[PDB]
Amino acid sequence: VAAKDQDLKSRPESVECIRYNFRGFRWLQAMIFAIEEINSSPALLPNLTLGYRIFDTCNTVSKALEATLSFVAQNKIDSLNCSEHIPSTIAVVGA
Amino acid sequence: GPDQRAQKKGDIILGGLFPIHFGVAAKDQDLKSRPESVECIRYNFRGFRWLQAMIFAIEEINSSPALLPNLTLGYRIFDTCNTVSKALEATLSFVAQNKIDSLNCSEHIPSTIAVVGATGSGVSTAVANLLGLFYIPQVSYASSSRLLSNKNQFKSFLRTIPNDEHQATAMADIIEYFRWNWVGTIAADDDYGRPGIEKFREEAEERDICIDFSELISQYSDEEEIQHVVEVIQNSTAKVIVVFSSGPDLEPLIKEIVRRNITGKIWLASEAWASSSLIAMPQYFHVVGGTIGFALKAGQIPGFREFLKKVHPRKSVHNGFAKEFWEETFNCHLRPLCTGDENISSVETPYIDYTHLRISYNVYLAVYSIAHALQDIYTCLPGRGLFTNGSCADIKKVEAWQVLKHLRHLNFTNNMGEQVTFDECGDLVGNYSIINWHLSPEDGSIVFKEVGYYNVYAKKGERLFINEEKILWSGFSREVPFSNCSRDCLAG
Ligand SMILES: *[C@@H]1O[C@H](CO)[C@@H](O[C@@H]2O[C@H](CO)[C@@H](O)[C@H](O)[C@H]2NC(C)=O)[C@H](O)[C@H]1NC(C)=O
Ligand SMILES: *[C@@H]1O[C@H](CO)[C@@H](O[C@@H]2O[C@H](CO)[C@@H](O)[C@H](O)[C@H]2NC(C)=O)[C@H](O)[C@H]1NC(C)=O
Ligand SMILES: O=C(O)[C@@H]1Cc2c([nH]c3ccccc23)CN1
Ligand SMILES: *[C@@H]1O[C@H](CO)[C@@H](O)[C@H](O)[C@H]1NC(C)=O
Ligand SMILES: *[C@@H]1O[C@H](CO)[C@@H](O)[C@H](O)[C@H]1NC(C)=O
Ligand SMILES: *[C@@H]1O[C@H](CO)[C@@H](O)[C@H](O)[C@H]1NC(C)=O
Ligand SMILES: [Ca+2]
Ligand SMILES: [Ca+2]
Numbered sequence: 038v039a040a041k042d043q044d045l046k047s048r049p050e051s052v053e054c055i056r057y058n059f060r061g062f063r064w065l066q067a068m069i070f071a072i073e074e075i076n077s078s079p080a081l082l083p084n085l086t087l088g089y090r091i092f093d094t095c096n097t098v099s100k101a102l103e104a105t106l107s108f109v110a111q112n113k114i115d116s117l118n119c120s121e122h123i124p125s126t127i128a129v130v131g132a
Numbered sequence: 133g134p135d136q137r138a139q140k141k142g143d144i145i146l147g148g149l150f151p152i153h154f155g156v157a158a159k160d161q162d163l164k165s166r167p168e169s170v171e172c173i174r175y176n177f178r179g180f181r182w183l184q185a186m187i188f189a190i191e192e193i194n195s196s197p198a199l200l201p202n203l204t205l206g207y208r209i210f211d212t213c214n215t216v217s218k219a220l221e222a223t224l225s226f227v228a229q230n231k232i233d234s235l236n237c238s239e240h241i242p243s244t245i246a247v248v249g250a251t252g253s254g255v256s257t258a259v260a261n262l263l264g265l266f267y268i269p270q271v272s273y274a275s276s277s278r279l280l281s282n283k284n285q286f287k288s289f290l291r292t293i294p295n296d297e298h299q300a301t302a303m304a305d306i307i308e309y310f311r312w313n314w315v316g317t318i319a320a321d322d323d324y325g326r327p328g329i330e331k332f333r334e335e336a337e338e339r340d341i342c343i344d345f346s347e348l349i350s351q352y353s354d355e356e357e358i359q360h361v362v363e364v365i366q367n368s369t370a371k372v373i374v375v376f377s378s379g380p381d382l383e384p385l386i387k388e389i390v391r392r393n394i395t396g397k398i399w400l401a402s403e404a405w406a407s408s409s410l411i412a413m414p415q416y417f418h419v420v421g422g423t424i425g426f427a428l429k430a431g432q433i434p435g436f437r438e439f440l441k442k443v444h445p446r447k448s449v450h451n452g453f454a455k456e457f458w459e460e461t462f463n464c465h466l467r468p469l470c471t472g473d474e475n476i477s478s479v480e481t482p483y484i485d486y487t488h489l490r491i492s493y494n495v496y497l498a499v500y501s502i503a504h505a506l507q508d509i510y511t512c513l514p515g516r517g518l519f520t521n522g523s524c525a526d527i528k529k530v531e532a533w534q535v536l537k538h539l540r541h542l543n544f545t546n547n548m549g550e551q552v553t554f555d556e557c558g559d560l561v562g563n564y565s566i567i568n569w570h571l572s573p574e575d576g577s578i579v580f581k582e583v584g585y586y587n588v589y590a591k592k593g594e595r596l597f598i599n600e601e602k603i604l605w606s607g608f609s610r611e612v613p614f615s616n617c618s619r620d621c622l623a624g
Contacts, residue, residue: 043287044537045267045518045519045533045534045536045537045540046518046519046520046537047519047520048531048533049267049533098261098285099261099264099265102261102262102265103234103235103265106231106234106235107235110235113224113231116221116224117133117224117225117228119237
């Protein structure tokens with residue numbers, strides 16, 4: 038991330054990721070490739086399609102925690118406490 | 133959110149995390165059925181006293197016109213049970229409004245402005261990640277791991293308890309003072325034990341001290357690991373053992389050592405178990421007697437004991453923890469049926485039986501630090517301010533990050549006449565008190581006698597003072613033991 042130190046004189050804003058990791062992009066493409074191959078292959082899990090929601094971590098705990106909070110939204114609503122548009126995540130790959 | 137809480141509404145809401153229990157049940161999850169909730173078992177009267185200290189501080193602030201007039205503080209306090217999962221449920225409860233603002237329905241959701249907690253360092257680490265996600269200040273009273281001094285990962289963490297670096301240096305100084313060079317080390321396999329024991333290893337390497345063994349223990353350790361550690365201790369010829377562990381995490385090992393009746397070992401304790409009731413009971417004085425340990429500076433809270441004695445399972449409606457406290461204290465159920473008429477003085481528990489207030493004073497100071505930050509928010513001249521164009525934050529519409537900014541620039545005065553500030557790492561500096569474990573001649577319990585101190589404000593090599601005339605090695609002997617690997621070579 039961008040090491041722009043915040044003095045908290047204004048409302049803090051989301052940090053910015055700086056350098057591009059091509060290897061991580063290749064790993065993400067590997068995940069997508071595996072999912073598509075599974076969907077096409079009828080031998081494994083027929084009549085069923087696997088989806089995905091993949092985020093960025095930038096080797097930072099905060100970004101991965103925001104993504105994880107997005108992952109557990111429905112379970113969070115069930116435990117702590119509306120719309121059913123929230124998709125339940127069966128498993129997470131990472132980090 | 134979780135139940136059994138302690139809630140009271142006010143204009144501004146503070147969060148709280150305290151160990152009302154020692155730990156959760158160890159029922160394994162076979163996962164053949166849907167996982168249920170986990171149950172906490174052992175009741176911690178000391179953590180309940182700390183919770184009462186926070187509530188007492190809040191009530192004292194709410195009664196004083198000198199601090200935050202026309203504003204009422206509130207509190208929403210939960211139990212952690214020394215477990216990350218319970219604390220994370222409570223923290224998810226804390227940040228519901230901010231979390232739903234970031235990710236994305238009732239407006240009644242109370243917004244926590246600051247959190248007080250927690251005791252452990254792993255628990256504080258998890259809660260600190262979650263709270264620093266939203267810049268909610270978190271002032272802890274007992275977490276002392278150096279890993280929490282990293283501000284790149286923990287943006288909003290503050291402490292009223294000193295760091296553990298000076299304590300490891302103090303242990304090295306003590307070992308050097310009594311001319312030992314052949315020692316052993318034990319630590320808890322957590323974020324508190326490992327950094328401290330590594331710092332001690334570095335200091336001992338600098339002071340020409342050899343270490344025979346280095347073992348790691350946990351409160352969930354199986355039998356195999358316990359016997360491995362015990363055999364490691366038993367084979368070693370070193371009599372001095374340095375322990376960085378808490379009371380709950382050290383109990384199985386001490387029990388197993390007592391079973392085999394292993395004697396003659398000098399125990400150097402850290403602040404976590406140097407005053408712990410799970411290690412300091414008179415059925416182990418043949419093993420842990422003569423323990424040399426550390427303690428924090430005490431504090432004076434006038435009127436705290438009287439408030440502690442006003443606990444009642446019916447009158448105290450804001451504290452949902454009073455019912456179980458009464459049931460455990462009197463062993464009744466509301467087991468004889470409770471009547472709500474007895475005296476807390478009748479039963480001897482860590483709730484009222486205490487001599488100094490050290491962690492409780494830490495909770496007191498944390499609450500007052502947040503209060504003084506809010507006060508500085510209130511008494512803010514429009515010309516000069518810490519935010520953009522030197523403005524001032526609206527006290528009626530105060531946000532958590534503004535409280536964080538004021539806490540980063542905080543300088544106030546205690547009730548005892550001392551200046552309270554936080555450094556760049558949000559840490560606070562304090563003395564240390566050396567104590568030794570003696571046997572009580574009358575009651576038969578374990579007495580903590582001060583035998584010296586550690587002056588952190590002095591220069592290196594002059595910070596330690598010990599009066600060995602007051603020490604009783606193994607509890608009875610006045611002869612300093614011998615803990616060198618080899619006998620000194622004579623002349624020629
Ligand atoms: C145990 O070993 C230590 C070595 O660290 C001994 O301490 C040294 O004692 C000599 C004797 O005069 C001093 O000159 C050194 O300065 C000491 N070194 C220290 C204190 O670090 C100690 O005497 C030994 N104890 C016994 C009982 O033999
Ligand atoms: C830590 O302990 C030392 C020693 O007890 C304190 O230093 C003493 O301070 C008092 C006044 O508070 C002086 O009268 C003594 O002469 C000091 N003794 C020394 C310097 O050896 C020190 O103030 C304590 N630190 C605190 C309370 O923060
Ligand atoms: O960081 C930690 O885990 C320890 C826990 C701890 C300390 N002092 C205590 C007294 C009683 C109970 C627990 C503790 C020091 N900080
Ligand atoms: C301690 O010594 C005995 C005797 O040689 C040995 O059997 C045992 O394994 C040793 N313990 C450890 C932990 O090495
Ligand atoms: C433990 O060993 C000590 C040392 O001799 C002895 O005095 C004590 O009676 C022993 N206790 C038990 C229960 O064996
Ligand atoms: C805090 O204020 C006191 C005055 O009460 C002053 O003596 C001290 O130097 C100040 N400390 C800091 C760190 O600003
Ligand atoms: Ca805890
Ligand atoms: Ca205790």
